[PDB]
């Protein structure tokens, strides 16, 4: 039932309006964000709204 989970590869929309590939580290249901780790090892909170799975629709 959860759409997002720890260890999931995702695309996250950043403050420049572009998508970046990352991996979910933590899911925060209270604030509806995930801590996402990016390719440069940076980690930021991203709104659920701005996150989608990288995996093929199937």
């Amino acid at each position: 039932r959860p759409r997002l989970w720890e260890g999931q590869d995702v695309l996250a929309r950043w403050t420049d309006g572009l998508l970046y590939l990352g991996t979910i580290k933590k899911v925060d249901s209270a604030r509806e964000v995930c801590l996402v780790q990016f390719e440069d090892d940076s980690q930021f909170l991203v709104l659920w709204k701005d996150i989608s799975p990288a995996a093929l629709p199937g």
Binding site: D16, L18, L19, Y20, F38, E39, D40, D41, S42
Partner: peptide, 10 residues
């Protein structure tokens, strides 16, 4: 990855 660089997807 340390020293890695972010690029916009696709």
């Amino acid at each position: 990855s340390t020293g890695g660089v972010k690029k916009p997807h696709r």
